[PDB]
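Entry, Tuesday afternoon. Goal for today is a structural model of the target with 2-anilino-6-cyclohexylmethoxypurine bound, before we commit to ordering more compound. Inputs were pasted exactly as handed over by J.K., no edits. I checked the ligand SMILES twice against the vendor sheet because last time a stereocentre got dropped in transcription.
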Amino acid sequence: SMENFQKVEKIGEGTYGVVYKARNKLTGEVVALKKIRLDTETEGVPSTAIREISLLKELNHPNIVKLLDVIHTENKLYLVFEFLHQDLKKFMDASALTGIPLPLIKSYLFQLLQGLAFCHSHRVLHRDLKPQNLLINTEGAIKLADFGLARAFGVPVRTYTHEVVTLWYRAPEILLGCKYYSTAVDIWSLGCIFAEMVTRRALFPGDSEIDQLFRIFRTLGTPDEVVWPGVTSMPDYKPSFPKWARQDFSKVVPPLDEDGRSLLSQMLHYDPNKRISAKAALAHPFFQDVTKPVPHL
Amino acid sequence: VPDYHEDIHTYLREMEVKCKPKVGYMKKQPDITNSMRAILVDWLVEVGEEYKLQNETLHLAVNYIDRFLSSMSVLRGKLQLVGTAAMLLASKFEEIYPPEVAEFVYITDDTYTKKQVLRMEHLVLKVLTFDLAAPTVNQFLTQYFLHQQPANCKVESLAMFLGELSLIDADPYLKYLPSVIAGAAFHLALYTVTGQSWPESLIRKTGYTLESLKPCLMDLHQTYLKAPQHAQQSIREKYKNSKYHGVSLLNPPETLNL
Ligand SMILES: c1ccc(Nc2nc(OCC3CCCCC3)c3[nH]cnc3n2)cc1
């Protein structure tokens, strides 16, 4: 059964289950094994494994990790995946003496927006982009991983779970309790991530919800009815918020050009309807010269 | 976020064809019948009300039962069991807070054990090969709802109720694709409540016209007329609540003018 794989070392624990690098004994492929412990007379197959498996087999794209197979036992459920070399967080931290060259940043941003448009386009919300979920290979590819918190969504959406997205990468619609959230939240995480590929440090590392909000507002300004119609009526919006001025974007990410600042700034629009969509962001002047350099490894 | 609306409508239309069930499966069911499937779907509406599940959930649950029975032969004492498992799966896929397995077991007045539920779930996951993201009538309705002038909440609600009656009866509704039942249902709602028709913009998005929808429209129209005598009535009961503007209380049009 699991006959043909040779487990080689564990990689880690993501949103549910455990991941090991393995080898196909017969063919030689290196796979990532996601082992989900079944447990009958509990709840059975978790919904995190039912969403991921069914959504990932619809998502086949160069920048969405590929789920190659599902070995379905009665005790264990294994998800078989295309294996990748490292995560962005792990690379970022390794390139922190001489950073990530711009070309590699752009290319990764370009490659993530492509995978992210493909998800949105097939009614899927990832809901948990962060560098740990973004895997890179030794060819320059970067891919969205860990669809454990993802979800099929409807047009107009409905209220989905609120407990969503890692704190630092979480959108202002989510932090203030908007009953409807969408695709604009994935873009917001890519906005933070883009800023981090550049400055090599998280943009809004809050320690709590309120911390998160205020860090966002110290950078982009406290939102008002002008910049974001409806904000002051939001569930967790408070009249007492400190009213902060918007810092000029060149100081938010000093090394970025004008195209890059324009693009990061469309990714971080407060108002979810004005946030640039992933599709549109692909034609931004930031990418005129996008290429695909192969990172140091 | 009409950024991806033509993209999602377009994908949904391709997956309704692949996620669709065999139209003739009940002729090959040695022991269950349309009426036996009619009783089960009714029950499931009711379970839906009971745990307060989304209507979408009742609609996926049904889609699973039809695709499971499209190829698995089932004795009539097991039909509910297929129906509870599909219902835990659909809940586990769409709901913020899925009812727990206890609750699935409890509402079968311990007709089945927990272990049986949980082995069927598993068995529904392999007949279906884990493809749970099927398009449903409700996904097509909500997209059609964006085209009213202005939104008419009786209209939405009555469309919901009719698309939902289409679930109960395998003959004629298994011959029709979700996009098409929602078509008929959105037309039947608008007409009854406002007098208006399938608008020009939905023709443009869907490619469906009154000529495409008639076959479904005639059928859905007799279902609307007989609703009060149908042996199954939990959809009628449910649509009496305030929550769907008591639209099961509106009078179906006398004729359709097609
Ligand atoms: C370093 C070395 C190796 C990897 N490789 C790798 N890992 C996966 O899950 C890795 C998980 C582990 C826990 C944190 C989030 C990511 C994969 N899923 C499909 N392919 C995968 N490849 C990745 C990083």
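Chain B has two domains: 7-20+134-258, 21-133.
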